[PDB]
């Protein structure tokens, strides 16, 4: 009786309701996405030349933070022990001009900047920049550079507003204005919080009387954005596979206690 | 991943789980709480800001099941539920 309802797909992002689960599982899904789902990211940079205005260390950080396409069809991204495969992203540039992510040349076409338009560093005339940047699989829990995106989640709820509440009409109007479902009866309006609702200060006094927010048990609204390493739906799939792999391996380790 | 047993006494097991962190540790502990025969399950983080970082679990039962069997049952639940959720996810997206 677990169900997903996909509500909205937007650039690099998705909003869905998951039902028939619970708070620990919702917490675990969010954490797994942020902390465990792996990506390729620049991890080490060998500079050969840098005549730019910036430190090696600053350029290396900017390279680390470029989202790299991560080929989930090639590498097992739910693996507990990640493939140590290293990709070389190289640059050999001379000013004048801006160096962009798109100027990086990859040893492996499957792993390169998802966005070619990210400015890295401007070079003046005569200034050279030459390096080999080494990208590897890693996890957000190790360094932010490997985190695949961002996760926002909330209880699915119904906000009940009694028509005894003066100007309840403003709350129906606000909900409609922001695309929240509203059901209207003789007694009340009911607002489904597929997004956060911001109760105007005017109505705070009515909380606990005329206005009540009721959680829908077992249902949660997730909003997920990818940085571009992975499609947002694949991020979710990988996270769920990771929980299967972890639990399976833990059972195997438990059996060794028996012995 | 590696289990290191720290302490054993009647109906009690304390252990490290190398290779894991809050994600699995919290889910495992919360799942254990579903079992009426588990009288305590909790964890703390050891070596929180170095590479030696690992969760330290304590699991206590009422004796009608061992800590080890409670742990296996909880881990199996996690596996089964993740499987079910993945199937529902694939049904929605493919």
Curated annotation (Swiss-Prot), chain A:
Q: Does the keyword Amino-acid biosynthesis apply?
A: no
**Gene Ontology CC terms, in alphabetical order:** cytoplasm; DNA-directed RNA polymerase complex
| Biological process according to GO | DNA-templated transcription
Q: Which domain of life is it from?
A: Archaea
Q: List, in alphabetical order, the Gene Ontology terms for molecular function in this entry.
A: DNA binding; DNA-directed RNA polymerase activity; protein dimerization activity
Q: Does the keyword Repeat apply?
A: no
Show the catalytic activity.
Answer: RNA(n) + a ribonucleoside 5'-triphosphate = RNA(n+1) + diphosphate
- Give compartment(s): Cytoplasm
Instruction: Identify the EC number(s).
Output: 2.7.7.6
Which keywords belong to this entry? Answer: Cytoplasm, DNA-directed RNA polymerase, Nucleotidyltransferase, Transcription, Transferase
Function of the molecule: DNA-dependent RNA polymerase (RNAP) catalyzes the transcription of DNA into RNA using the four ribonucleoside triphosphates as substrates.
Q: Which PANTHER family match?
A: DNA-DIRECTED RNA POLYMERASE, DNA-DIRECTED RNA POLYMERASE II SUBUNIT RPB3
> How is this protein organized at the quaternary level?
Part of the RNA polymerase complex.
Q: What is this protein called?
A: DNA-directed RNA polymerase subunit Rpo3
From Swiss-Prot, chain B:
Q: Which GO terms describe its molecular function?
A: DNA binding; DNA-directed RNA polymerase activity; protein dimerization activity
What PANTHER family does the record tag this protein with? DNA-DIRECTED RNA POLYMERASE I,II,III, DNA-DIRECTED RNA POLYMERASES I AND III SUBUNIT RPAC2
Family classification: Belongs to the archaeal Rpo11/eukaryotic RPB11/RPC19 RNA polymerase subunit family.
Q: Which gene encodes it?
A: rpo11
What is this enzyme's EC? 2.7.7.6
What InterPro entries does UniProt report for this protein, alphabetically? RBP11-like, RBP11-like_dimer, RNA_pol_Rpb11_13-16kDa_CS, Rpo11-like
HAMAP family in alphabetical order: RNApol_arch_Rpo11
Assembly, in brief, is: Part of the RNA polymerase complex.
- Function according to Swiss-Prot or TrEMBL: DNA-dependent RNA polymerase (RNAP) catalyzes the transcription of DNA into RNA using the four ribonucleoside triphosphates as substrates.
Record keywords, A-Z: Cytoplasm, DNA-directed RNA polymerase, Nucleotidyltransferase, Transcription, Transferase
Q: Name one GO cellular component term.
A: cytoplasm
**Cross-referenced Pfam families, in alphabetical order?**
RNA_pol_L_2
The Gene Ontology biological process terms listed for this entry are:
DNA-templated transcription
Question: Would you say which domain of life the source belongs to?
Answer: Archaea
Name the species this protein comes from: Thermococcus kodakarensis (strain ATCC BAA-918 / JCM 12380 / KOD1) (Pyrococcus kodakaraensis (strain KOD1))
**Catalytic activity entry:** RNA(n) + a ribonucleoside 5'-triphosphate = RNA(n+1) + diphosphate
Record localization: Cytoplasm
CDD domains in the record: RNAP_L (cd06927)
Q: What is this protein called?
A: DNA-directed RNA polymerase subunit Rpo11
